[PDB]
Amino acid sequence: HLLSAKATLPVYDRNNLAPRIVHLGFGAFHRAHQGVYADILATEHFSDWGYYEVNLIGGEQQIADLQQQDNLYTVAEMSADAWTARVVGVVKKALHVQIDGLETVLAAMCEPQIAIVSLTITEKGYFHSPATGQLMLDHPMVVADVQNPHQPKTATGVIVEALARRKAAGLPAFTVMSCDNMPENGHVMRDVVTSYAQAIDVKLAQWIEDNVTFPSTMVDRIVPAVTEDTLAKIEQLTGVRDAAGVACEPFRQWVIEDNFVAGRPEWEKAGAELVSDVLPYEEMKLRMLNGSHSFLAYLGYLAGYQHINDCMEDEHYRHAAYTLMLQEQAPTLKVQGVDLQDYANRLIERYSNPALRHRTWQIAMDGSQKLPQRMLDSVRWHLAHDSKFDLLALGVAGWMRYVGGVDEQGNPIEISDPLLPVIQKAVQSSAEGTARVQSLLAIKAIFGDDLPGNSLFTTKVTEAYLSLLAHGAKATVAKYSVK
Template sequence: MKTIASITLPAAVQRPQYDRTKLRSRIVHFGFGAFHRAHQALLTNRVLNARGGDWGICEISLFSGDALMTQLRAQDHLYTVLEKGADGNQPIIVGAVSECLNAKLDSLAAIIEKFCEPQVAIVSLTITEKGYCIDPASGKLDLHQPRIEHDLQYPDEPHSAPGILVEALYRRRLRGLGPFTVLSCDNIPDNGHVVKNAVLGMAQARSPELAQWIAEHVSFPATMVDRIVPAATEESLAEISAILGVEDPCAIGCEPFIQWVIEDNFVAGRPEWEAAGAQLVQDVRPWEQMKLRMLNGTHSFLAYLGYLAGFAHINECMQDSAFRSAARRLMLEEQAPTLQISGVDLTAYADSLIARFANPALQHRTWQIAMDGSQKLPQRMLDGIRVHLQREHHWPLLALGVAGWMRYVSGVDDAGKAIDVRDPLVDKIRAIVDTSSEAERVTALLTLQEIFGTDLPQNPVFVDAITDAWRNIAAHGAHGAVKFLLNT
């Protein structure tokens, strides 16, 4: 079988510039998904290109990915990233992966032992929010999740990510080996804290002494990750094979922009990621807040209002002059003033976001971004609104965004078509929608404390602003409401 490892690739394809035989699995990564391939692994590949070294990655997939990993092995652990810009594409062969293990192809015992090898310095994760098994209400490990219950009963045969991490650390301590750094790269607010809570919660339930050792020796740096990496599709894979001249089922396409801000707190060393453009900082929180409010907050605004107005993709919203100026105004006039970051040119950042959103090569669906709004609204819009309320400033575009979410979850777009609303709170939301009239809808949805807390529904300025925005959309449609607001 021909693979990217066995054929001569076209000259435009960037190939690893370093000696791959030197790689050792010093990073073990959980979750060989789309994002990791185009982000952390790609940046590690860049460091190896720039500096050489032995920082290889062992990829671990627990629940799926056996076909992907069989293929990865067949192509010498090489795969392709296609960076797709408005001005052209750049194919890159990533060589940073040294090996891979999968629960179906290999044994669970082999996976756990991999974490216990002495050279392992970092365990990184992109396992999505649910992989951490955290109870959203308490922010602590959910001891009642079936996988966690299983791991507490059979600690040496764990099935969950927290269970595997704790068992590996337990064995390392027993064998007199040093700890590793646990590096979450999931897009979750305060991800370092989240993974720390998961690991310490599991360790504490096993043995307070083990928990204390972990708390003293293991670090959990927070990260802010940014790059748009849509899931691979038949079309995106076909596009990449046409460029390579051979199929690569492990390939992934993404935008050219990439950002990684990392808290510089590693207990056993790290690659020189700054040589690849990563920012190593003391405190990631201001960066995370900037991204959540300016990028993600505006994405959500465009997703709800854009979807209602009939736009299937974000780049189509950006071709519309009203949506485009509303997005830029939202970023600079309503989100930027609420941030705590200093030393960043926020106008340049906003302009780079507008250019990224407009990239026609990335077909990012408004429906996809609109999903799970109950989990996203607080950090993307409501926290910033609280700042404006305190300062008695106006925030009309944020109000339109929140009202846009309310109309979106009400289930019908501006053309009268039903919306497939996906959200962990969908049953609760549907019950509210079904039992409230249009006139009551805003106050009815504001009873969702998980989203709005208890402060916002009791604040008349907040309730009035959302009600006005709701009426604006009801009267003019989402597109008309955006235009109306820009002209007032």
């Protein structure tokens, strides 16, 4: 049914694509981002790089959806000015450990032509401490894989077992490319893989060290979670109902460290920035975009703004986000050759996209995994430089107020976070007010050891938090926006 859609369709020969990349975490973002880059290459630049799409944990529905429409899916770009749709054809096979089985997945990863394994498994999928970037060796998912390394359940476990098998077969290693929203995401990937391999087999660890590269990336495209309204809107645009369809903004960026062991698609031809060092761009985007996103998510949700576009209708939230981007995030950056005021202006325009409904609740998810790179590293810069960080402090206070679990009208907030048990215990064991700040600050996996030991940070977050309690989020953002 998809080939009758009002959309651009795969005009290249799909059978001529080889499955050369295995992607872990077939979610909305991968579909609308990397999948689109690959499809442009297959369409315009004679690329034969196709994908095996694999889900290991959750995401059973996406995989099943593909399996009955010849692995095709729809991406619809939407903004105020235009919409466009594309039916993507680069997926050669879509697998799920719960459907096809783990052995089939490992076998696919051990085919000789697999050159890259890429990941969008969310920050929590790495089972690392957000504050340190290091593998949690005592995490039950990690210990279970370490005890049963040939039947792994984690992404790292699966990757390392695939590598063990390739090594034993005398097959070349693949490159492992994280596309998740962490600074130096290739270092995180390298570290967790290395720590894990060393825990099970030191010869395998050394071979991995000698044969695998872990290039870092920066990825950017706003892709809200797909709802029934999303699917209905894509149907209305294309004429065809696609359960695996995704809606996104027209903007896309992908910065890639050019360090691959077994080749790569010519992504630069589809608009990727292939460079030697991605870190300054990661920090730029994680801080100015994701940091402002998070600020808006907690303080917007608490004010009763359901979506980011709703936040942008409040001139104070608009001004606060802009001031946060340019006066607090931008000065912490080392990036060269970018007009950051213009970038900030463009982010506000992107947030104001009236064609998307990006829920503050969705962005608020997994705050424990996001705070360090999005806000806390910037705070550290300001602390070291004796510089003010008022809006960052309010952002942190906003997360703290949110995870208290009761909204300003006295209704429950459903908190989604892998550290929920720790967060709940911190909330339940502390009185509202100044005690609550102290208690949440004490979660070292989020705040590290320096920030809880920092009197200035503690004072500023506490002041912001007491303002949220006394005046609510909406009025507090208004106050801080002129401050």
